[PDB]
């Protein structure tokens, strides 16, 4: 079955440039015109470029005219978007989508890749175990939490017991304060479970090669 796979996201300093790839499979690439659609952190979808099957009709969003270059290598089933003069606004999730709705029948979007254009820098996070000591929640229930603060950029992977514990957990979305992110995840287990068992926060900030684990031990 059809499947597009974007890939070229990263942290890019303003003014810099990045070149994304969108691999396609399950369809005669060479017959359809592709598109690139972006979506800003918490906003809508926004069309960006469109290249006809032959690469002989290209269109561009007013917002990207001139800075971006769209292209494809038909024999390698890959679409591309070369970016230039990456502003802050350029920050978003870059999905690739097959087009030519005119007759085509099927319609297929990608997963999206993320490109964050900041001046910031990378910054590994600190993981603080949130041992109850007052995590009330009912008494018959004992909630624990985990604090991941001071990282950049997104995303990070938090998990309760290397995956194992995956029920009763509420991971809250990240928030940018100053020029850093903070995220936390709560998780609930029955009184008995903790501390008879060991629940652990495993955080991994990909973009900075950071992987950590926190034994949520009682005390404070």
């Amino acid at each position: 079955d059809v499947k597009l796979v974007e890939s070229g996201g990263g942290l890019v300093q303003p003014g810099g440039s990045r070149k994304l790839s969108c691999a396609a499979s399950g369809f005669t690439f060479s017959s359809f015109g592709m598109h690139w659609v972006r979506q800003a952190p918490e906003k809508g979808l926004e069309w960006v470029a469109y290249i006809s099957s032959g690469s002989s009709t290209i269109y561009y969003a007013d917002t990207v005219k001139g800075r971006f270059t769209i292209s494809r290598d038909n024999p390698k089933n890959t679409l591309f978007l070369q970016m230039t003069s990456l502003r802050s606004e350029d920050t978003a999730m870059y999905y690739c989508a097959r087009g030519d709705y005119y007759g085509s029948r099927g319609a297929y979007w990608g997963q999206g890749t993320l490109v964050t254009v900041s001046a910031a820098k990378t910054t590994a996070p600190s993981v603080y175990p949130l041992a109850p000591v007052c995590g009330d929640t009912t008494g018959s229930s004992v909630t624990l939490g985990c604090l991941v603060k001071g990282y950049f950029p997104e995303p990070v992977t938090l998990t309760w017991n290397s995956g194992s514990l995956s029920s009763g957990v509420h991971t809250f979305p990240a928030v940018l304060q100053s020029d850093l992110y903070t995220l936390s995840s709560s998780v609930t287990v029955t009184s008995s479970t903790w501390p008879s068992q060991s629940i652990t926060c495993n955080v991994a900030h990909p973009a900075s090669s950071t992987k950590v684990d926190k034994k949520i031990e009682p005390r404070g």
């Binding site: 709705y101 979007w109 809250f172 979305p173 928030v175």
Partner: protein
């Protein structure tokens, strides 16, 4: 640009209830309207195209229609899978414009939060900082007020809130209040209250620890 004014911008409805999102295009598109559906996991899937042709797979309870320059998607009898974000797409003229969005949330029956206050971790303290995280779980509606109170006083400078999306199973929201302070100031006060006000009850669901010996 051909503006696609989409509405409403969000709406809650109970299951089985019908809904009609609408897109008004500012120019003739001759029905080159399409309706996309973005699921919370990010995933995008087309539902209707050619302004009324359902895609292969899309349940026959979805139906596009057009009258004038007003295009409408009607979901009759809303089931769970329908909880998502919809976008209208007009592919008639070059600068391709999308509608604004509709965030369709599930109308659940009321549910008060489950506040649980957590004092600073000993590892953070030695870092110099001190954060008093305070989770408020499984409530509904989303509307929830949280006041932080270091000792007698209510404080603001330092709060870092972050709500969750409507949960997949219980359809309830969840929050995270995080007051940060320098170890210094934290250890120069004694009580800390995370008091939340929610439509479920009338009396502030208070949760407060306090430092001192142990």
């Amino acid at each position: 640009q051909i503006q696609m004014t989409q509405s409403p911008s969000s709406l809650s409805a109970s299951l089985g209830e019908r809904v009609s999102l609408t897109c008004r295009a500012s120019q003739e598109i001759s029905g080159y309207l399409s309706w996309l559906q973005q699921k919370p996991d990010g995933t995008i899937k087309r539902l209707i195209y050619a302004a009324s042709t359902l895609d292969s797979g899309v349940p026959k309870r979805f139906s596009g229609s057009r009258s004038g320059s007003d295009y409408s998607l009607t979901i009759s009898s809303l089931e769970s899978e329908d909880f998502a974000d919809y976008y209208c797409l007009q592919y008639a003229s070059s600068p391709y414009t999308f509608g604004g969005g509709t965030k369709l949330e599930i109308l659940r029956a009321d549910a008060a939060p489950t506040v649980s206050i957590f004092p600073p971790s000993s590892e953070q303290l030695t870092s110099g900082g001190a954060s008093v995280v305070c989770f408020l779980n499984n409530f509904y509606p989303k509307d929830i007020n949280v006041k932080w109170k270091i000792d007698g006083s209510e404080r603001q400078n330092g709060v870092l809130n972050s709500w969750t999306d409507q949960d997949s199973k219980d359809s309830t929201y969840s929050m995270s209040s995080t007051l940060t302070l320098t170890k210094d100031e934290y250890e120069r006060h004694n009580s800390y209250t995370c008091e939340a006000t929610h439509k479920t009850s009338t009396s502030p669901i208070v949760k407060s620890f306090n430092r001192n010996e142990c």
